[PDB]
Write a protein that binds this ligand. Structure first.
Ligand code: UI1
Length: 245
């Protein structure tokens, strides 16, 4: 996350940290997720499509630093990885970038809600915030496009939703962004999501409720001029979501 502020998991309790074990025993950070229901995390199909075996993934809840056990965290394996069957990727844009992970403990249990571990509510059909709304994103992703390491402590920032009409303009994304996707950014291009933040939450306060409005999906550069973050518009996938859970 370019700019913003470090923060800790008690300020984002639905954020899930998804790692992958490799042959030989090392483990590295993959993408973020959001806790939807006690047994289900939602993220982006692009983070898992090239390594689709459910056994390799580790999920943490209640975790604030990349490389330490925070008090109160819980660790999960994946009972079920569901990718969208119509996912695709173009040169920039990705389609139907949405995945579900049914989580379980070694003992067989789903998440146990607590002060650091909580779900985030889905949106309702046809009702997303108006353009210009301020929303937050959180993740362990890059602090500068040229870094090659992710920060050791969790970060957050705030960005504003951008309309389809503006985001379809020639110097922004043209026809490559569709009505299934939401655009969001900083009017001054100083802060943004970036590589390593994919799959994480875009949380919007709407009618007094916090809502999982988008899923971090893609973007040209990070906090580059007239290049917004682009996010999966969760409200279109409520039919798909309910049927696979
Ligand atoms: N600017 C953004 N809001 C934003 C959001 C998501 C991004 C995802 C990615 C990204 O690469 N995701 C990703 C997509 C598909 C696969 C599997 N082949 C593997 C990985 C890259 C971004 N841009 C970036 N630019 C310079 C340095 C680092 N990253 C992203 C930018």
């Amino acid at each position: 996350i370019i700019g913003g502020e470090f923060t800790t998991i008690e300020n984002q309790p639905w954020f899930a940290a998804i790692y992958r074990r490799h042959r030989g025993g090392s483990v590295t950070y993959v993408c973020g997720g959001s806790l939807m229901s006690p047994c289900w995390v939602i993220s982006a199909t692009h983070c898992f499509i090239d390594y689709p075996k459910k056994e390799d993934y580790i999920v943490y809840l209640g975790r604030s630093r990349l490389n330490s056990n925070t008090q109160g965290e819980m660790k999960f394996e994946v009972e079920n990885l569901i990718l969208h069957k119509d996912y695709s990727a173009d040169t920039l844009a990705h389609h139907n970038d949405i995945a579900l992970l049914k989580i379980r403990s070694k003992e067989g249990r789903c998440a146990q809600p607590s002060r650091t571990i909580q779900t985030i509510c889905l949106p309702s059909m046809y009702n997303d915030p108006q353009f210009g709304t301020s929303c937050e994103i959180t993740g362990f992703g890059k602090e500068q496009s040229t870094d090659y390491l992710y920060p050791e402590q969790l970060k957050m920032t705030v960005v504003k939703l951008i309309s389809h009409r503006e985001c379809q303009q020639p110097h922004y994304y043209g026809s490559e962004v569709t009505t299934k996707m939401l655009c969001a950014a900083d009017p001054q291009w100083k802060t943004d999501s970036c590589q390593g933040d994919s799959g994480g939450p875009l949380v919007c306060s709407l009618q007094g409720r916090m809502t999982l409005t988008g899923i971090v999906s893609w973007g040209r550069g990070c906090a580059l001029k007239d290049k917004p973050g682009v996010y999966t518009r969760v409200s279109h996938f409520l039919p798909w979501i309910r049927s696979h859970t």
